[PDB]
Amino acid sequence: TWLSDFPQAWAETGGMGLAVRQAPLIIPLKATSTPVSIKQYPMSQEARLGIKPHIQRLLDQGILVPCQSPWNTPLLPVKTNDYRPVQDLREVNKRVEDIHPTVPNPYNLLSGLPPSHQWYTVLDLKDAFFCLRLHPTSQPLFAFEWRDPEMGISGQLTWTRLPQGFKNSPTLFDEALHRDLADFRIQHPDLILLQYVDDLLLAATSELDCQQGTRALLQTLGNLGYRASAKKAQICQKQVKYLGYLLKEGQR
DNA sequence: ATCCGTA
DNA sequence: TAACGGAT
């Protein structure tokens, strides 16, 4: 199967990703920016318990590390009745220098799919932002408080990877992956590759070309340190769901 | 929690 | 202005 020929390429079988060719990201602040320290709002035990194993996992993965920083933003519990950690990074976002929004809207992106290429593969990358390292100098920006009263735990944690909730993550990820896949595009002139942050579409003129192109794309992604979702993967189909659209016969 | 945008 | 939906 596809899952066994490319074990490195799938979130299921490859372990965590890390885009090794991408230098750790440095996040420039606006000229007048001063650190902001917002106090953590008290969390109910239910929400704390709901969130705890997620925090523990990220610590075990090295994605969260202890720290002490002049920046602090609130951790929110967000619920299905399962709680997930959602950091409110809005006051950090306002203080970070703006970048040009280079991710195309899906309409314009799909306008680049010729009707000549009707064999499709759709892959989405698992925990994409977490594959990009954050430079130690910018890590402090994203600190929050983790207090576990019934374990005598207090202190800040922060991210070593590009974080959810950060206004520039989607754009920075899209740009990083474009740099990492540029050569692939060069080696495969006959293929169409659409990238929308972590959502990929490969289109080919024939099923053979799609099979051979998908193999090469999976191999490339795994080698670069990215991980595709095998569960959601749509491989060499005449019809696929991409970015809310149904792609079929060159339509949509 | 807090911030932004329809009767 | 109260109220809500959606966002972090």
Side-chain angles (χ1 to χ4, degrees), chain A residues 1-79 81-252:
Chain A
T1 48
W2 291 90
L3 228 189
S4 60
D5 279 356
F6 309 95
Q8 178 172 249
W10 302 110
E12 286 76 8
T13 47
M16 184 52 185
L18 194 168
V20 292
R21 322 255 278 239
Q22 293 305 311
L25 292 171
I26 292 174
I27 305 303
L29 296 179
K30 291 170 175 190
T32 58
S33 286
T34 308
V36 57
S37 180
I38 305 168
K39 223 303 190 183
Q40 173 62 53
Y41 323 119
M43 188 169 296
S44 70
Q45 181 183 279
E46 176 182 306
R48 177 166 54 270
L49 257 17
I51 278 176
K52 185 168 160 167
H54 298 113
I55 300 300
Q56 186 58 238
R57 184 111 23 73
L58 294 166
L59 285 165
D60 294 345
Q61 287 170 143
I63 293 163
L64 286 182
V65 292
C67 84
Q68 199 179 326
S69 160
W71 298 83
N72 201 80
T73 46
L75 201 66
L76 310 165
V78 186
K79 278 198 281 312
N81 268 342
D82 202 74
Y83 280 106
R84 311 299 204 107
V86 172
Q87 191 172 15
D88 178 12
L89 280 174
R90 285 177 304 177
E91 290 303 313
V92 166
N93 287 336
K94 301 148 93 104
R95 281 168 178 84
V96 162
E97 189 75 12
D98 290 326
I99 63 177
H100 196 63
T102 59
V103 192
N105 56 74
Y107 191 92
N108 299 334
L109 182 63
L110 271 302
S111 84
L113 219 212
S116 45
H117 296 55
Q118 294 183 191
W119 291 93
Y120 312 125
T121 288
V122 173
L123 304 170
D124 68 285
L125 307 177
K126 185 90 179 326
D127 300 320
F129 302 160
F130 291 170
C131 293
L132 297 188
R133 293 165 296 176
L134 196 55
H135 189 95
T137 306
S138 298
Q139 292 180 8
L141 238 58
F142 301 103
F144 58 94
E145 170 68 10
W146 183 251
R147 42 213 247 194
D148 187 6
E150 293 77 37
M151 267 196 58
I153 301 302
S154 202
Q156 291 168 298
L157 307 179
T158 196
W159 305 89
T160 63
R161 309 288 182 100
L162 191 59
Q164 287 281 336
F166 172 45
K167 74 174 172 188
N168 292 343
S169 287
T171 300
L172 287 167
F173 183 87
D174 197 60
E175 295 177 356
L177 186 58
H178 269 286
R179 298 189 291 273
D180 276 353
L181 292 182
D183 180 64
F184 173 90
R185 289 173 183 276
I186 289 156
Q187 300 316 130
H188 302 267
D190 308 327
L191 299 182
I192 295 297
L193 177 62
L194 267 39
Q195 301 171 222
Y196 187 73
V197 194
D198 55 0
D199 296 305
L200 316 176
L201 174 79
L202 193 65
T205 284
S206 63
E207 185 183 25
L208 176 53
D209 266 28
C210 191
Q211 296 175 340
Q212 294 176 335
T214 304
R215 285 188 190 106
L217 176 63
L218 287 167
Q219 179 68 217
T220 298
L221 287 170
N223 289 186
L224 290 172
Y226 305 95
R227 303 294 182 255
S229 160
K231 173 62 166 290
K232 302 168 74 182
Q234 293 167 92
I235 308 209
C236 297
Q237 287 165 198
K238 292 258 47 180
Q239 133 183 350
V240 299
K241 296 133 206 78
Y242 185 59
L243 303 183
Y245 292 100
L246 187 53
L247 278 35
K248 180 177 171 179
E249 313 276 342
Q251 289 305 121
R252 273 208 139 170

